[PDB]
Amino acid sequence: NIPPKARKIMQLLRLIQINNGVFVKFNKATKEMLQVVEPYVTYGIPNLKTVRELLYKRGFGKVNKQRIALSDNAIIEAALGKYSILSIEDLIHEIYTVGPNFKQAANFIWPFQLSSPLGGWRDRKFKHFIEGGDAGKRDEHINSLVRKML
Amino acid sequence: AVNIIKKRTKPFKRHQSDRFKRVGESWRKPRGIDSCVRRRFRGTISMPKIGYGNNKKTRYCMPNGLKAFLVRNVSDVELLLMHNKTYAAEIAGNVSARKRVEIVEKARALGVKVTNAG
Amino acid sequence: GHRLYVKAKHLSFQRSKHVIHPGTSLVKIEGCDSKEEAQFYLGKRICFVYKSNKPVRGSKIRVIWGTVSRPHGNSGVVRARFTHNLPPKTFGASLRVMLYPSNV
Amino acid sequence: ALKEYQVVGRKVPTEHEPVPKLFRMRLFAPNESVAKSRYWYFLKMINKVKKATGEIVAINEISEPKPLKAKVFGIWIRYDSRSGTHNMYKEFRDTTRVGAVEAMYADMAARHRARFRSIRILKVVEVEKKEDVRRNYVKQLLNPHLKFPLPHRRTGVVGLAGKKVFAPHRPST
Amino acid sequence: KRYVEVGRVVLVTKGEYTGKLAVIVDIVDHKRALIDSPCSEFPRQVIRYGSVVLTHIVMKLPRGARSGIVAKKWKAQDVCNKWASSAWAKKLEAKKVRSQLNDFDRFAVMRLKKQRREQVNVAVAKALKA
Amino acid sequence: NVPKKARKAVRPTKLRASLAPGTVCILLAGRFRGKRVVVLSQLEDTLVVTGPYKVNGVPIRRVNHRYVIATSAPKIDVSGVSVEKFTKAYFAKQKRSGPVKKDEAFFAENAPKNALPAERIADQKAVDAKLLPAIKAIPNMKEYLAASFALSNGDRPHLMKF
Amino acid sequence: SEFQKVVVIDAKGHLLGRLASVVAKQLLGGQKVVVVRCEELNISGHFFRNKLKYLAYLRKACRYNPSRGAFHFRAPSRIFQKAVRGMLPHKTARGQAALEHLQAVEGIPPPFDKQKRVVVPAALRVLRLKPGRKYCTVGRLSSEVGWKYSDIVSKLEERRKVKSAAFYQAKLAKQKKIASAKAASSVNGKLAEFGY
Amino acid sequence: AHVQKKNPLKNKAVLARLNPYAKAYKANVKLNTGKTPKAAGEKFLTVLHEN
RNA sequence: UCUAGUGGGCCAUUUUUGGUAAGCAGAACUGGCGAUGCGGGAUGAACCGAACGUGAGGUUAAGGUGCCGGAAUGUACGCUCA
RNA sequence: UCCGCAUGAUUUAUAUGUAUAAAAAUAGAGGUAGGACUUGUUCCUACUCUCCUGUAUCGUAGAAGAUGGGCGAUGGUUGAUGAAACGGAAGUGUUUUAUUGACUUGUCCAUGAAAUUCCAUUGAAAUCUUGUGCGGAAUCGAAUCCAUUGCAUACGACUUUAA
């Protein structure tokens, strides 16, 4: 039960499954897209701990259109060596501090397949975060959500 | 041929074969417009699916890790001279007792196990 | 000779309202009233002891063994997994929780 | 669980208005995101500012200066019932103004079936004088010689020993 | 017989401070009151009446007293030994000691109780026979 | 074909601090279940335990560290007992690969009378002579060891101390 | 904590539904339960509500054959048993076995008057019903509904109480003598160090 | 190659195979070896306790 | 490029038209059933959650934790006697 | 067909101490020889014992529990006979009394438990009927069919009679 516009936006954001997470750079275009898909996603500001934990545990890269675990720096160097990204550490740096090749760095990472949160969601999940649900902008509370979901 | 695990041991009996004698137990895919078995309602019998397929490494293997190769004569038994540790001879039912004795002796000489000896 | 086990009762299998999972059993242990107290009994061996009619090896007593895995609920009930699933005709029967894998 | 935040915001400076006025208010919200949402919700009533056309310049959580002393808090609220909009004043004795607000929300929900969304906290003040304390039941707690028995409860369970299914004797009080 | 007033001594039965003495110095409302204890580990706080049990000890203390004067009045009065030399506290202490013993202590208790049982059985037999 | 060589190196077992030598422990399983014994030394994953034969009747044997409950009873001095004598090969059954049968007329020879040769009891007598003053000095220890362990009605192992 | 073979519950001062819920749970757990003095059970609400509810229950009978219709038992023990049966899955073999282990009776018969009787604090009226709110008695409800043995049960209870009081006095004498002997024992001084 | 994924947050060897700086990484370093003053301000305090 | 089946639809939200109204008839958007099993609403094509290969372990959604029934006869503040 | 000279099957055994019999209310006598005389809606007696419910009390050492002793009691526990009494709500149970047994761990002593040499097992003993060796004889039967009656009746069934 997804409307065509929200479904198209989530496809373009690569959020095609429940409990899937992606990194985006916040501009006017992405802000308006997230506004349209507000009832179906949560988003917020991740910190360094969340970014590094995501890329270390759930870090999967897209090489030859295949989901390959980031178990070695050679894979990252092969995929993003032209952008001076040779390791998981500078991949984390590019994701955290939005640099020049953020588009390539974020697209190389396969969307994170998070588990169901430990402890569950709130009492009602499909209300806005302001109303007491788990939808829309939650600011730094995305860090707690990712911690439970990782 | 090590740690042979069967996903399912039941034979997938046909629907209503237990109720009607004219309906055999051989599986038939239900194609009714109101077939609860086809729709897979809870509590109904399961239908055969590709997911039930056993491991390719352990497929066709008997619990002893061998494959029952059917043999009708001594020449058939000689086919397993090199494949002694993977195939076991199974004597055909139409073979006479006189020829079955020779088949058993040849299998014993070649070391090939017999599934239905004696 | 006396007992070296805690009394327990076999309540039911792990289940939803209408779906049962006989692979795990719910066990109520005497004196265990909270999931915090259930942590002590986690991993302990639990046995179901019953009688038969055919002597086997000279003894008419048969025992099915299992291990407590995780607490269930908030009232000290635990989940147990047995080598052979406990028959549901034993719902409400007595089980013995041993101290065999002790850490105290 | 509620917390009190002071929120200071303003309108985005424009060509005609290079120095917009700064507006501050105290809001009782579970978190900072709800506090800023409440700030914009209340600001949209009087001013012509929105979240898109405005910005929050400060948000600070306020703790009780004297959490370890008993005070009387008078709360003026405006709420919407099933018929119309009403203004009420209530008194609560508490050691924290946030706790008094939470007690006010619980009391309104229990009595008038008023939800959080339908209640606006107009003002919360501390009354240190019985000459301005007007509720008789609150004032009766200020007398120097106050004594009463324990409220009728279900006796003491006392640890896990009260979890026994059966009891050997009848309870005593 | 016991009421809730300023100066009433209570015993905490719920929370981390279970089994600790406190004195009510201010009554917040009919459901909560502010309590304090001279002990350093017990901080002045606000507690509900369901988490405490009233005692028989009532001390003379002004309403809204501070921690320092609460301790001073606690030391000046004999509230410490008043609670200590009571059936309630003695019975609690016996319970605490009974829960703070190991298997060797249990064996020693069993032997001592066996000796007491034999002596008591002889005593009652002799007294009844007369 | 040859299997791959696994990377599972054997490392020494680290036991609980409560299972120190000289500690009184309660046997939970086996023939001597419920008995109270004294820990002599520590093997790889087991404990060499023996209740003194003049009080308990449990010989020098092994017990799994998981199958004992350590007791906070006062420690028994086991300083000089020659622990190095007891090894894995000491409590090791004879080489029984090949000609072994378990028919009748074999339990009359496996009895301790016509079995269990010297250097077992002879050393046990000397070790008990060395260890006797500790038990004699500690009151109630001899009777405590001689008494077995049991769970009475209302006993909760998760809350009681040992 | 209570895994004993058979438990005898004195139903006086208990609430019918809460006691039935506890009893049914114990029966499913595998515990034999004997409920005595079912005529002293209490039901919240004033007597007219409970009388009207029972009358509405009694009005429900099979239209074409009342002999096969619903059977309305008037005894207080049978009212308690009906509540337990409704709380139990009696239409299965497991539920029937659980119900077979319940023995609810009026008064305390000779099989159980010399046995220990316990109470369920979670079902006690004094602990569950707010004071000042009126409640009815199942014995009175049964007597006004058609139970015939209210007076004889009361007379037998008077005799049992007289016998029980005599037994208590005889037990009290022994208890006082044991306590007096134990008070003078010198072992108590060295035993108090262990909390005994 | 890569028959089984090891979590670097759990496996120290994998945490060393990646991120060579992890061994030299330091944390929980004290930076309050000074008078450590307070920056509150009378204006800020009055605004905070305005009403 | 070739060809099959289809050319009776129905339900729900929202915007409506004709009718006193309808489980009525006729239009627009979206999601569904038809062809959708599973958990929940005691029961159910559409409602909520969620779309399904064979299994193990963990965590959840909607919905619940007196008993039937798996899970607190949980905590805090009040209201109500029918 | 009852007692024993005993074998076997079963359970108490849905067992592992699965031991515990006052009444009623809770702003009260909660009662605990409760005391206090003067058998009463009495005290200033006892007064902080009531309130932490049972986290209580009783029992609990011994080859699944053995062999021989010194001290301390002058008792306790478990059975069979004996004199009995009291229990009818389903009393099938509760006390008391003499003989006959065995232990007594209240305390100190000695010998002996092993190899069942790291767990997968639940023990001795008591009661009950059915099979076999019975000495002692057997204090002792009914129902139905076939008949009969009509106080009954389609047939069964029912009410009578019979030797």
UniProtKB/Swiss-Prot annotation, chain B:
InterPro entries reported for this sequence: Ribosomal_eL32, Ribosomal_eL32_CS, Ribosomal_eL32_sf
Cysteine pairs bridged by disulfides in the record: none
Matching PROSITE patterns: RIBOSOMAL_L32E
Domain of life: Eukaryota
Coiled-coil blocks: none
GO biological-process terms attached to the record: cytoplasmic translation
Main localization category: cytoplasm
GO molecular function, one term: structural constituent of ribosome
Residues modified to Phosphoserine: S75
Subcellular location: Cytoplasm; Nucleus
Subunit description: Component of the large ribosomal subunit (LSU). Mature yeast ribosomes consist of a small (40S) and a large (60S) subunit. The 40S small subunit contains 1 molecule of ribosomal RNA (18S rRNA) and at least 33 different proteins. The large 60S subunit contains 3 rRNA molecules (25S, 5.8S and 5S rRNA) and at least 46 different proteins.
Further remark: There are 2 genes for eL32 in S.pombe.
Name of the protein this chain belongs to: Large ribosomal subunit protein eL32A
Species this chain originates from: Schizosaccharomyces pombe (strain 972 / ATCC 24843) (Fission yeast)
Source organism phylogeny: Eukaryota, Fungi, Dikarya, Ascomycota, Taphrinomycotina
Swiss-Prot record, chain C:
Subcellular location field: Cytoplasm; Nucleus, Nucleolus
Origin superkingdom: Eukaryota
InterPro entries: Ribosomal_eL33, Ribosomal_eL33_CS, Ribosomal_eL33_sf, Transl_B-barrel_sf
Pfam family, one: Ribosomal_L35Ae
GO molecular function, one term: structural constituent of ribosome
Gene3D superfamilies: translation elongation factor selb, chain A, domain 4
UniProt function note: Component of the ribosome, a large ribonucleoprotein complex responsible for the synthesis of proteins in the cell. The small ribosomal subunit (SSU) binds messenger RNAs (mRNAs) and translates the encoded message by selecting cognate aminoacyl-transfer RNA (tRNA) molecules. The large subunit (LSU) contains the ribosomal catalytic site termed the peptidyl transferase center (PTC), which catalyzes the formation of peptide bonds, thereby polymerizing the amino acids delivered by tRNAs into a polypeptide chain.
Subunit-structure text: Component of the large ribosomal subunit (LSU). Mature yeast ribosomes consist of a small (40S) and a large (60S) subunit. The 40S small subunit contains 1 molecule of ribosomal RNA (18S rRNA) and at least 33 different proteins. The large 60S subunit contains 3 rRNA molecules (25S, 5.8S and 5S rRNA) and at least 46 different proteins.
Name used for this protein in its record: Large ribosomal subunit protein eL33A
Organism: Schizosaccharomyces pombe (strain 972 / ATCC 24843) (Fission yeast)
Gene: rpl35b
From Swiss-Prot, chain G:
Keyword field contains Metal-binding: no
Pfam family, one: Ribosomal_L13
InterPro entries attached to this UniProt entry: Ribosomal_uL13 (IPR005822), Ribosomal_uL13_CS (IPR023563), Ribosomal_uL13_euk/arc (IPR005755), Ribosomal_uL13_sf (IPR036899)
Entry's Gene Ontology BP terms: cytoplasmic translation; negative regulation of translation
Location of the protein in the cell: Cytoplasm; Nucleus, Nucleolus
MF annotations from Gene Ontology: mRNA binding; structural constituent of ribosome
Keyword Iron appears in the UniProt entry: no
Sites bearing Phosphoserine, chain numbering: S150
Highest taxon above the source species: Eukaryota
Keywords on record: Cytoplasm, Nucleus, Phosphoprotein, Ribonucleoprotein, Ribosomal protein
Main subcellular location of this protein, as a coarse class: cytoplasm
GO CC field: cytosol; cytosolic large ribosomal subunit; nucleolus; preribosome; ribosome
Further comment: There are 3 genes for uL13 in S.pombe.
Stated family: Belongs to the universal ribosomal protein uL13 family.
Summary of subunit composition and partner proteins: Component of the large ribosomal subunit (LSU). Mature yeast ribosomes consist of a small (40S) and a large (60S) subunit. The 40S small subunit contains 1 molecule of ribosomal RNA (18S rRNA) and at least 33 different proteins. The large 60S subunit contains 3 rRNA molecules (25S, 5.8S and 5S rRNA) and at least 46 different proteins.
NCBIfam families attached to this UniProt entry: L13_A_E (TIGR01077)
Name used for this protein in its record: Large ribosomal subunit protein uL13A
Annotated organism of origin: Schizosaccharomyces pombe (strain 972 / ATCC 24843)
From Swiss-Prot, chain H:
Region of interest called C-terminal-extended nuclear localization signal, as start-end residue ranges on this chain: 1-51
Compartments it resides in: Cytoplasm; Nucleus
Other comments on record: There are 2 genes for uL4 in S.pombe.
Similarity annotation: Belongs to the universal ribosomal protein uL4 family.
Assembly behavior: Component of the large ribosomal subunit (LSU). Mature yeast ribosomes consist of a small (40S) and a large (60S) subunit. The 40S small subunit contains 1 molecule of ribosomal RNA (18S rRNA) and at least 33 different proteins. The large 60S subunit contains 3 rRNA molecules (25S, 5.8S and 5S rRNA) and at least 46 different proteins. uL4 is associated with the polypeptide exit tunnel. uL4 interacts with its chaperone ACL4 and the nuclear import receptor KAP104.
Domain description: The eukaryote-specific C-terminal extension harbors a nuclear import signal and delivers the ACL4-uL4/RPL4 complex to the pre-ribosome, triggering uL4 release from ACL4 and incorporation into the 60S ribosomal subunit.
Official protein name in the record: Large ribosomal subunit protein uL4A
Name of the encoding gene: rpl402
First-to-last residue of the parent protein present: 313 to 363 of 363
